[PDB]
C-alpha cells in the first residue's frame, strides 16, 4: 500500500541519484583527463630543496628533533622582514541618502495583442496604488508608510467647426445633447450614428481620457488612434444609453481646516506643500522672505529649527538654481546634497578617524550623517549587534527615528570623542524629512582629526 509506494519512490530516487552521479562522473572523467594531460604537458624546475646554509649569519638555528630514530637537523632561521599593520574594521555599504529598512488577480496590459475593457475601479489601478508624492517613487524605500493602497488597486472654449477632419461639435445638433447629458448627471442627435468596431484597448483609453478631459474632443481625437470625433460623440451617447520634532506627514482633506482634528496639528508641525488641505490652512507655514543666507535667528525657519521648502520660501533662495551648488540660503544645504570631502586614516586616538581635507569655520555644514532608518526597537537590536564587537554608530534623529550607519553609511561615521569637541550635531527638518547635519563648533584648520561629543547622542 503506502509503504509499497514509498519503497518504489525510494528506488526511483536511488536510480536517479546513481544515474546523475555516473553521468557527472563521465563528464568529470573527460575533464580530469584533459586536466592530467595539462599536468603532464610541462615539467617543472627540479626543486633540490637544499638545506640552505650552515649558520650563514651566525644566528639561531633550527632544532628538528625527529620523533623517530633520526638525528636532529639544524637549519638557520631565515627571518623575514615585517610590514606595517592596519587597524581593524569591517566592510560597509556606500550611501548618500537615508534608507528605511523594513521592520481575477488583476487586469491585463494594453501593451501586447491581448487587451480588453475593464473599469471596475476605473482603468487606472496599477499606477495609483504604489505611489509617494514626496519622493516621486513607486514603492519607495525612503517613506515606508502604512500604504493603505494595496494589490495594485477646467473651463475651455467650445470646439466649433470640423477641426481638421469632421468634429463632434460640427455635427448637426449634438452639442446641446452633450450639454443636456452633462447637466442630467447632477434636432438633438437625431441623425443615425456610424458603426465602427472599437477594441478593448481603444475603449479603455478613450474612457479614461474622456473622464480626465470631458468636453474637449479635438484634442482627445488627436491623441487617440483614428477615433473620428463624430464617432467619439457616438460612443459618448451610446455609453449613456447602455448605462520631539517629527517629519511633516502630509494631510489630504479639501475644504477642511486643520485645527484640533489634523495629524499635523497633533504633531505641532506645519502643513507643507504635500498637504492637500485648503490653501488658506491655519497650520500652513508661511514662506520666509529673507533677503539672503537665512542664517540669522530672524527667519522663522531658522528660529524654529527648520530648513526652507522651495515651494513656500521663494525669494529666500531655496528654490532658484536647483541644479547648482549650495544655495544662498544656508538653511537648505542638506537637501541640496552639497557637503565637505572627508578622508580616512588611522586615528591618533584610537582606530580610524575622519580627517577633513578643507577647513570649516564656526557653525558650518560639513556632511550629513546618513544611514538606515530603524525604529527604536530595531535601533536597540542593531546597536546590541554593533556593540558585540564594541564599536557603535547609532545616532538619534527624531523621537521615533534613529539613524544607524554601521552596515551602510558614509565617511562621517568615523567621529572621535573628547570633552572639548571641534564639532556639534543639529538636526534640521528638510522638506518634511529629518536629516542630521554635522556642524563645526569652532574655526577648524586644515587636516586635523575631528571630534563630536557622544553625550549629545543616546550612546554617550
Amino acid at each position: 500500500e503506502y509503504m509499497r509506494l514509498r519503497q518504489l519512490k525510494r528506488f526511483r530516487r536511488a536510480d536517479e541519484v546513481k544515474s546523475m552521479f555516473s553521468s557527472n562522473r563521465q563528464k568529470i572523467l573527460e575533464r580530469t583527463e584533459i586536466l592530467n594531460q595539462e599536468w603532464k604537458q610541462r615539467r617543472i624546475q627540479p626543486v633540490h630543496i637544499l638545506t640552505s646554509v650552515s649558520s650563514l649569519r651566525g644566528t639561531r638555528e633550527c632544532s628538528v628533533t625527529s620523533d623517530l630514530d633520526f638525528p636532529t637537523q639544524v637549519i638557520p632561521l631565515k627571518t623575514l622582514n615585517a610590514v606595517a599593520s592596519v587597524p581593524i574594521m569591517y566592510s560597509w555599504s556606500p550611501l548618500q541618502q537615508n534608507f528605511m529598512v523594513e521592520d481575477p488577480e488583476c487586469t491585463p496590459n494594453i501593451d501586447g495583442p491581448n487587451a480588453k475593457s475593464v473599469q471596475r475601479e476605473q482603468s487606472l489601478h496599477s499606477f495609483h496604488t504604489l505611489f509617494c508624492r514626496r519622493c516621486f517613487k513607486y514603492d519607495c524605500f525612503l517613506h515606508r508608510k502604512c500604504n493603505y493602497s494595496f494589490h495594485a488597486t477646467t473651463e475651455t472654449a467650445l470646439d466649433n467647426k470640423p477641426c481638421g477632419p469632421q468634429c463632434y461639435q460640427h455635427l448637426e445638433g449634438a452639442k446641446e445633447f452633450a450639454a443636456a447629458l452633462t447637466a442630467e448627471r447632477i434636432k438633438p442627435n437625431i441623425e443615425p450614428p456610424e458603426n465602427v468596431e472599437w477594441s478593448g484597448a481603444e475603449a479603455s483609453m478613450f474612457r479614461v481620457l474622456i473622464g480626465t478631459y470631458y468636453d474637449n474632443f479635438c484634442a482627445i481625437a488627436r491623441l487617440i488612434g483614428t477615433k473620428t470625433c463624430r464617432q467619439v460623440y457616438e460612443f459618448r451617447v451610446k455609453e449613456s444609453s447602455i448605462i520631539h520634532v517629527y517629519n511633516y506627514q502630509p494631510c489630504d482633506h479639501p475644504r477642511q481646516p486643520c485645527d484640533s482634528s489634523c495629524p499635523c496639528v497633533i504633531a505641532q508641525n506645519f502643513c507643507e506643500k504635500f498637504c492637500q488641505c485648503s490653501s488658506e490652512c491655519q497650520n500652513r507655514f508661511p514662506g520666509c522672505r529673507c533677503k539672503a543666507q537665512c542664517n540669522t535667528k530672524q527667519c522663522p525657519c531658522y528660529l524654529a529649527v527648520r530648513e526652507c521648502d522651495p515651494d513656500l520660501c521663494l525669494t529666500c533662495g531655496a528654490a532658484d538654481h536647483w541644479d547648482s551648488k549650495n544655495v544662498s540660503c544656508k538653511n537648505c544645504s542638506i537637501q541640496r546634497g552639497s557637503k565637505k570631502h572627508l578622508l580616512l586614516a588611522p586615528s591618533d586616538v584610537a582606530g580610524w578617524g575622519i580627517f577633513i581635507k578643507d577647513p570649516v569655520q564656526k557653525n558650518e555644514f560639513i556632511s550629513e550623517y546618513c544611514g538606515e532608518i530603524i525604529s527604536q526597537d530595531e535601533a536597540d537590536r542593531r546597536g546590541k549587534v554593533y556593540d558585540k564587537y564594541m564599536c557603535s554608530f547609532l545616532f538619534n534623529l527624531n523621537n521615533d527615528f534613529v539613524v544607524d550607519a554601521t552596515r551602510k553609511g558614509n565617511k562621517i561615521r568615523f567621529a572621535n570623542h573628547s570633552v572639548n569637541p571641534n564639532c556639534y550635531a543639529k538636526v534640521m527638518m528638510v522638506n518634511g524629512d529629518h536629516r542630521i547635519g554635522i556642524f563645526a563648533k569652532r574655526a577648524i584648520q586644515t587636516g586635523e582629526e575631528l571630534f563630536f561629543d557622544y553625550r549629545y547622542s543616546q550612546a554617550d
Binding site: 552521479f21 563528464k27 628538528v64 628533533t65 633520526f70 631565515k78 623575514l80 606595517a84 566592510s91
Partner: protein, 365 residues
C-alpha cells in the same frame, strides 16, 4: 574495503612547538623531483623533505616573530615566469606573505584585510588567482601576478558574517563560500562581468593609471541558501558537479543546487529548494576551523580528526556515498590534525598535528 593502503615512513618536529594549521603537498611537482610539503606554526613556518625507505628530513624554517604574528594557511602554488614553487602564508594580522623556499627570501606582502585571513585556495586554470576568505565579513580574490584586488565578494546581501573558506569547482566554473552566517551562497564566476574584470586585471597596471583599481563588489550572489547547515559551515568543496561542503555537523553533505532534474548551470537565482543526496558521517570531529582535501583524481577524499584518526574516502566507484572506506591510524598520533594532503600520484600523504609534527604515509601501490 577500498583499494588503497598507505604506510607511514618517518616524522619530524619543529623548533617553535606551536599549532600547525596550513599544510599541503607540492602537487605541482612532476616525476623525478622528490616530493615536498609545508607546515606552519607560531611565527615560524617550516618546510620538510622526507625520502623513501622510511626517512624524513628538514630543509628550511622561516621565522617572522618580529611582531605578534601567527600563520593560518600554506596554500601551494608556482610562478610561471620562473617555474619555481611558491608558498603563500597569511593569518593573524592579515598579511599574505609569498615565501620562495628556493631563494629563501620573501616576495610579496598583501594588506587590506580587516581581520585575520582564515583560508586560501588557488584557481586551477590560473595559478595567479588566490582566494582569501578574510574575517571582515567578506571574501576577496587577489591577482598575485599584477598585485591587485580583482573582486570583493560581499555587500548588501553577501557574507553577513566572517567567511571561513571557499572552494573551486572541478574546472573552477562556480565558487561556493561557506561562512559563519550559516550561508553557503555560490558566488558564481560564470558571469561576463567577472571574466571582463579578470581580463582587465590581466592587462592592468597600478602605475599606469592614477585612479585605484576599479574592483567589482558582488553584493548579491548568483545563488544562496541558509538551511542546509544548522550551524556555521567551515569547509566547502566541489565533488564533481555536486557540493562537498562540510560544517560542524560531522558530515560533508553531497547535495546539489535546485531540484533533482534541473541543470545547475541554468538554475534561476530565485531557486529556494535544493536537494540533498548523501553525506559522509564520522564522530569526534566537532571542533571548528579544520580543512579537508581529496586527491587530484578525486578518488581519495581525506579529512583530519582532533583525536588523531585519519579517513580516506573512495569516490571513484559508482553510486552516491556508501560503504565504510578505510581509517588510517598512526603510532605517534596524539594531537589534532588541521590539514591532510595526498600527493598528485596516489602514493604519498602526510598528516600534520598541532605541533608542526608531520607524519608522512606512503601507499603500497
Amino acid at each position: 574495503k577500498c583499494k588503497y593502503s598507505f604506510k607511514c615512513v618517518n616524522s619530524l618536529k619543529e623548533d617553535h612547538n606551536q599549532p600547525l594549521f596550513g599544510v599541503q603537498f607540492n602537487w605541482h611537482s612532476k616525476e623525478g623531483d622528490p616530493l615536498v610539503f609545508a607546515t606552519v606554526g607560531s611565527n615560524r613556518v617550516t618546510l620538510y623533505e622526507c625520502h623513501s625507505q622510511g626517512e624524513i628530513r628538514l630543509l628550511q624554517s622561516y621565522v617572522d616573530a618580529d611582531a605578534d604574528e601567527n600563520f593560518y594557511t600554506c596554500a601551494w602554488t608556482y610562478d610561471s615566469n620562473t617555474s619555481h614553487p611558491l608558498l603563500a602564508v597569511a593569518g593573524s594580522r592579515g598579511i599574505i606573505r609569498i615565501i620562495n623556499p628556493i631563494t629563501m627570501q620573501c616576495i610579496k606582502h598583501y594588506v587590506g584585510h580587516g581581520n585575520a585571513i582564515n583560508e586560501l585556495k588557488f584557481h586551477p586554470r590560473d595559478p595567479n588567482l588566490l582566494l582569501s576568505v578574510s574575517k571582515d565579513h567578506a571574501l576577496r580574490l587577489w591577482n598575485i601576478q599584477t598585485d591587485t584586488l580583482v573582486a570583493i565578494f560581499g555587500g548588501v546581501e553577501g557574507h553577513r558574517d566572517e567567511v571561513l573558506s571557499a572552494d573551486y569547482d572541478l574546472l573552477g566554473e562556480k565558487i561556493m563560500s561557506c561562512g559563519m552566517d550559516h550561508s553557503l551562497k555560490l558566488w558564481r564566476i560564470n558571469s561576463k562581468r567577472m571574466m571582463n574584470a579578470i581580463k582587465e586585471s590581466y592587462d592592468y597596471n597600478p602605475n599606469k593609471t592614477n585612479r585605484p583599481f576599479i574592483s567589482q563588489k558582488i553584493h548579491f550572489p548568483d545563488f544562496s541558501t541558509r538551511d542546509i547547515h544548522r550551524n556555521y559551515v567551515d569547509c566547502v568543496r566541489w565533488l564533481g558537479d555536486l557540493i562537498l561542503s562540510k560544517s560542524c555537523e560531522n558530515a560533508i553533505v553531497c547535495w546539489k543546487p535546485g531540484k533533482m532534474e534541473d541543470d545547475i548551470d541554468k538554475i534561476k537565482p530565485s531557486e529556494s529548494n535544493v536537494t540533498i543526496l548523501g553525506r559522509f558521517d564520522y564522530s569526534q570531529c566537532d571542533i571548528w576551523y579544520m580543512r579537508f582535501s581529496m586527491d587530484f583524481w578525486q578518488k581519495m577524499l581525506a579529512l583530519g580528526n582532533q583525536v588523531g584518526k585519519l579517513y580516506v574516502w573512495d569516490l571513484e566507484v559508482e553510486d552516491p556515498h556508501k560503504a565504510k572506506c578505510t581509517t588510517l591510524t598512526h603510532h605517534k598520533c596524539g594531537a589534532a590534525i588541521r590539514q591532510t594532503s595526498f600527493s598528485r600520484d596516489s602514493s604519498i600523504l602526510i598528516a600534520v598535528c598541532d605541533d608542526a609534527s608531520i607524519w608522512r604515509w606512503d601507499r603500497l601501490r
